[PDB]
Write a protein that binds this ligand. Structure first.
Ligand SMILES: Nc1ncnc2c1ncn2[C@@H]1O[C@H](COP(=O)(O)OP(=O)(O)O)[C@@H](O)[C@H]1O
Ligand SMILES: Nc1ncnc2c1ncn2[C@@H]1O[C@H](COP(=O)(O)OP(=O)(O)O)[C@@H](O)[C@H]1O
Ligand SMILES: [Ca+2]
Ligand SMILES: [Ca+2]
Ligand SMILES: [Ca+2]
Ligand SMILES: [Mg+2]
Ligand SMILES: [Mg+2]
Lengths: 74, 371, 160, 126, 371
């Protein structure tokens, strides 16, 4: 169920990162607050993505280093 | 870009880029978890050694093939084997390469559908195509007709083809192959005192079979000769010494191919299922099939099989027809060479199962027009 | 010991005379100024100890560079301070690995002589080309013009 | 000549490398912060009708879901890369382990203690 | 902080801080109460001299080892020995140091559980771990495979290991060791007139065995030579004069190792239990075990044993395999050097049995995952 687990986790993320959002009963102050929450969530997701990009760069560099070491050892 | 011509097989995975002469990486398809406890700390012991790495540490592993008879019985292990093949033996990410798997005839549908679903979801290839293992072996011979007997290690199948038009009602698939010959050899070696039981020692018996066994031209005469003289007894050195001497077990192991009653199978040998496969064809293409009988697959590498089979078929067939058996020296990799040729064709370039097509029809696309 | 050696390195030459006087106070009878196996063994036995002569000769070999097998005055000081061990843990492996990964500007997994020159110029300390050659020799064992991860570790082995 | 000057040069190289790494990391942090600020669309929380407010909030929610999906995909990719590089590190250890275990240095018995015991306080180094 | 690598052994207790080359304090493990009356008043006579102090006053003591064959038979004396080792030979309170004891294979559980209970309740260590005495000796050689024969003074055990995976079904533990050789030497010395009976004179016979005995390359030829010439008779001066001359008792005492029928034991010698231990292993790792046979322990220090054992195994083994016997000069402390290396590892730092874990599961924690 590994691929099934991945799909389930993705679908949950659709509902976990973004919970049940009902803007109809939210007044103007509440609407502004929820919009700011959405904006900050997007900003945090951007920060996480940037960190992931940096980690991937480091992983590629270290992978190249390990390949060089493997070639040198033999 | 270039296409990846993988060929799962059963016993040896053969892979390589399209357009070459020989597969780039050939290694047994076994995944063996360690079975003992392990006391050294920090030794860097992994949880599963796959491929050719587990043929060197086989002393403390329990090797288990993930493909029994053509069909795949253990999908996680097969996924592991594919991942190893792509990333460590070829070092090309699959995101940028089409793949051309191969499949035996008359296999369960679910196997093929799961194969395509894995290739499209896990490895995320651009496009993959599944081809019958005998048409490729016919490509490699440079023919366009002929009846090909592809006696692999998992399953022996016999697909007749004429002028490019395959005859679906004349495919005779038989499940006797190299693995059953290994088991039978391991079972008849016990008549001299040598007992091989562990799944690791099956590899040693396989090596004995490869290096010593041969197919007798006439069975009874060989049985009589080996029982009087001693000119046949060839010795072989185990991985630790204690040489062994194989007597008339030499030609009795591969004789099972022509008399499947030895291992209790009912069906007729590979010498008579070819004739039956021919006789199911139409009356006007039997001469061409008689003249262009093709051998392929690993198990047809026994020294002296291309003569025994010709003698048997000549006995069965009408006296006027000419019986010719094509046995190229590159028999083992014939299927993969044919796969490379097929993937290198320009006319074939639009038959791949493109990913958007799979997204629209699901894994059941493989049974559709894109076969 | 090594730290104490570095600290005393900013002192006068008479400290060597003081150390010789102390060694005479211990085991008076030395005349050549070189501490072989017998002298160190005798002084430790008087203290109630016994260094293995294998360790002593290993120290002699490590402190030797021209292959003379003897000790000069500064080499005598280094040999004397080698009687104890203080360089612990060799700084930190992870930080050294990070510095080496920063060294590879071209990210080829190796460090050539040009990158060494650039790093030395960045340091700016009073150095000569002879020191650069010595460092390159101590780093590039196979003389391939590059520095491997294992070779970099060995070059930075026991370095704080 | 003596390795003391060579050791000093090596330590100077290490210190300069550490300072350069710190500077590069700080610059990368600043650039990352500026880029992240640029990426996110500024908020407009003034002069909007209530129905328009709800519509804009729903649009922001949809964009949030899109970014959630994108970041989940990137997270999965980076996790796969982490697993693969961990496998590579394991293989590196396998090809570089075996007999390559460093050993501590304790073969020298305590010498300062005996020196002080048999010579009072003259041993000023230890 | 630093770890304490203690190694109880049986005959010599070896201890020292982790990360050094040699144990800091090595002293016999004997506790001897005085046996005579004692007339001087105020002489400061203690009630039990332990360790190396009782090897100098042994003239008026009754020395008795607290460890018979690996197992511990007298727990109070063993506690006294440990207390001495911690407080007087190392002078480090155990409240601030992890400990790494060592234990022979196939020992009774109760011994190990009592050992951990003592270490956690009486001495109150932060964390202790128990390791098999052969894996350490394999660490010290810098190998990762090989079959190690650790012939101590209490018990001789033969643990085969491959690629870090110990084979628990191939451990052959034999209870002939240095102590039985001392008793047999003391028993055959009576054939010339020298009678040693007192438990103090067992130490003198042990010194004779250490300084004079050697293992003969070929037993019958040596027996014939010593019975004709007199080139073997080496003399030795007792602690009071009256030199003695040892004839063919020199190579007959350690010959008991290869023929345990001398002391009435049924089993086969150390030359044949190694071959049996190898043959129980799988067929594919026998070459590596043949090539990496490791010797350790004190009793394997006899001059000329690394050649006799190699000759015997080469006689038993198949002619093709290469037989190599690793006999490092630092044989006696091999187990402790390996213990220091293991305790100095970073990967091992989380395997200690932390005290809170013992408080939650009792002394039976040692048999659990934290082995
Ligand atoms: N030289 C040889 N002689 C005899 N038998 C062989 C030889 N080489 C391979 N075989 C048998 O053929 C098998 C390999 O067949 P192969 O063609 O690789 O199967 P697949 O179709 O799965 O690739 C082996 O298991 C072995 O038993
Ligand atoms: N140089 C030597 N020659 C012969 N036998 C020795 C020598 N040194 C020690 N022995 C024997 O080995 C024993 C010590 O073995 P040891 O390895 O200390 O046992 P343990 O495994 O309990 O530490 C002594 O009782 C002695 O009989
Ligand atoms: Ca010199
Ligand atoms: Ca570079
Ligand atoms: Ca280099
Ligand atoms: Mg095939
Ligand atoms: Mg021991």
């Amino acid at each position: 169920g590994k691929r099934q687990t991945e799909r389930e986790k993705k679908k949950k993320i659709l509902a976990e990162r973004r919970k049940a959002l009902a803007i109809d009963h939210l007044n103007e102050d509440q609407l502004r607050e929820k919009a700011k929450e959405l904006w900050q969530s997007i900003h945090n997701l951007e920060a996480e993505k940037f960190d992931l990009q940096e980690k991937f760069k480091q992983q590629k560099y270290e992978i190249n280093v390990l390949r060089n070491r493997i070639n040198d050892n033999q | 870009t270039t296409a990846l011509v993988c060929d799962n097989g059963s016993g040896l995975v053969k892979a390589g880029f399209a357009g070459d002469d020989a597969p780039r990486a050939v290694f047994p398809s076994i995944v063996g978890r360690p079975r003992h406890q392990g006391v050294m700390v920090g030794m860097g012991q992994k949880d599963s050694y796959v491929g050719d790495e587990a043929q060197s540490k086989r002393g403390i592993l329990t090797l288990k093939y993930p493909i029994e008879h053509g069909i795949i019985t253990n999908w996680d292990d097969m996924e592991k084997i594919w991942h190893h093949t792509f990333y460590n033996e070829l070092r090309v990410a699959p995101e940028e390469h089409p793949t051309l798997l191969t499949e035996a005839p008359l296999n369960p549908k679910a196997n093929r559908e799961k194969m395509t679903q894995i290739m499209f979801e896990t490895f995320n290839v651009p496009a993959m195509y599944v081809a019958i293992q005998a048409v490729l072996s016919l490509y490699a011979s440079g023919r366009t007709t002929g009846i090909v007997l592809d006696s692999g290690d998992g399953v022996t199948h016999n697909v007749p083809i004429y002028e490019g038009y395959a005859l679906p009602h004349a495919i005779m698939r038989l499940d006797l192959a190299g693995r059953d010959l290994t088991d039978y050899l391991m079972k008849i070696l016990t008549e001299r005192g040598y007992s091989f039981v562990t799944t690791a020692e099956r590899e040693i018996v396989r090596d004995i079979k490869e290096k010593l066994c041969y197919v007798a031209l006439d069975f009874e005469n060989e049985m009589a000769t080996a029982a009087s003289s001693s000119s046949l007894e060839k010795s072989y050195e185990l991985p630790d010494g204690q040489v062994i001497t194989i007597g008339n077990e030499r030609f009795r192991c591969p004789e099972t191919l022509f008399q499947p009653s030895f291992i209790g199978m009912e069906s007729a040998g590979i010498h008579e299922t070819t004739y039956n496969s021919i006789m199911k064809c139409d009356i006007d293409i039997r001469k061409d099939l008689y003249a262009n009988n093709v051998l392929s697959g690993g198990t047809t590498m026994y020294p002296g099989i291309a003569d025994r089979m010709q003698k048997e078929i000549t006995a069965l067939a009408p006296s006027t027809m000419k019986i010719k058996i094509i046995a190229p020296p590159e028999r083992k990799y014939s299927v993969w060479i044919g796969g490379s040729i097929l993937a290198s064709l320009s006319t074939f370039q639009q038959m791949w199962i493109s990913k958007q097509e799979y997204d629209e029809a699901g894994p059941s696309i493989v049974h559709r027009k894109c076969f | 010991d090594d730290i104490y050696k570095a600290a005393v390195e900013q002192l006068t030459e008479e400290q060597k005379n003081e150390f010789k006087a102390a060694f005479d106070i211990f085991v008076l009878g030395a005349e050549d100024g070189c501490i072989s196996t017998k002298e160190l063994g005798k002084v430790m036995r008087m203290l109630g100890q016994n260094p293995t002569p294998e360790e002593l000769q290993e120290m002699i070999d490590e402190v030797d560079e021209d292959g003379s097998g003897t000790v000069d005055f500064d080499e005598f000081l280094v040999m004397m301070v080698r009687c104890m061990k203080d360089d612990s843990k060799g700084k930190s492996e992870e930080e050294l690995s990070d510095l080496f990964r920063m060294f590879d500007k071209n990210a080829d997994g190796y460090i050539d002589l040009d990158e060494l020159k650039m790093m030395l110029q960045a340091t700016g300390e009073t150095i000569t080309e002879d020191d650069i050659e010595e460092l390159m020799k101590d780093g590039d064992k196979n003389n391939d013009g590059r520095i491997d991860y294992d070779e970099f570790l060995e070059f930075m082995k026991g370095v704080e | 000549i003596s390795a003391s000057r060579k050791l000093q040069l090596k330590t100077l190289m290490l210190q300069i490398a550490k300072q350069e790494m710190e500077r590069e990391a700080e610059e990368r942090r600043g650039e990352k912060g500026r880029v992240l600020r640029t990426r996110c669309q500024p908020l407009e929380l003034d002069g909007l009708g209530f129905e328009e407010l709800q519509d804009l909030c729903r649009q922001l929610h949809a964009r949030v879901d899109k970014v959630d999906e994108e970041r989940y995909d990137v997270e999965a990719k980076v996790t796969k890369n982490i697993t693969e590089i961990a496998d590579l590190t394991q293989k590196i250890y396998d090809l570089r382990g075996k007999f390559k275990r460093p050993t501590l240095r304790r073969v020298r018995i305590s010498a300062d203690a005996m020196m002080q015991a048999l010579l009072g306080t003259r041993a000023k180094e230890s």
